[model samples]
Target: MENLNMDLLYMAAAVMMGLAAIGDAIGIGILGGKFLEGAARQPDLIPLLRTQFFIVMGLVNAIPMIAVGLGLYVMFAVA
Candidate 1:
């Protein structure tokens, strides 16, 4: 029974992380591509755009990072 419960917990964590990763990948891919296109058109503002891009990237990734951290904690701490 204990092993079964642990297995279920692991499965739940895995699914959560996997879904989060998929969303993050799609979001970042689109965002980065657009940012690149904008940067190319406005080369003089590349530095400012890069800074803003990093900020947005960090903010966007925070949720997925937290999800991944929680999944790791469950896999290691709970297991």
Candidate 2:
């Protein structure tokens, strides 16, 4: 692996981390606003909406959380 370059790996990990952070923030923000609006429109559905909101938030975070894990692995192990 004489020709192997760590700079590329570092850059890849950084990009992944940056994009994941931004995407997660935006996704959760969007979900929250919509959730609030729906809950406001139908107070009786608050419980269901709250439950679904948590479920969707968990799902939305799953990928970006994996990105963080993978990015950290690359930074510590591969870099």
Candidate 3:
């Protein structure tokens, strides 16, 4: 019973992280597409846009990265 509970706990964490990753993947695609459109329209703004894109990308991925870390800890340390 205890082992079964732990397995369930681990599965929950994995699901949480997996969903987060899928969300981020979709986000990145949208962001990249917008960036490309903007760049095509305003070539001169590419440098500024590139800088902002990286910043936003980092911000966007931060939560998912944290989710992965927490999931690993839950699976290895908690379980």
Collision count for each candidate, in order: 0, 0, 0
- Writing each residue's lDDT as its tens digit, candidate 2 over 1-79 gives 5226766666786776769676875687577668877788888978887887777776667666676767767667755
User: TM-score for all predictions?
Assistant: 0.57, 0.57, 0.61
For every candidate structure, what is the RMSD over all alpha carbons to the true structure, in angstroms? Answer: 3.1, 3.5, 2.9
* Order by lDDT, highest first: 1, 3, 2
Clashing pairs in 1: none
Encode model 3's per-residue lDDT on 1-79: one tens digit a residue: 7766987877887777679686876587468658877787888878877777777677666666677767777667755
Number of the top candidate by lDDT?
Answer: 1
Residue 59: error of model 2 in Å? Answer: 3.6
Lowest summed lDDT across 10 adjacent residues in model 1 is found at: 24-33
Top candidate (TM-score): 3
Q: Candidate 1 or 2, higher lDDT? A: 1
lDDT of 2: 0.71
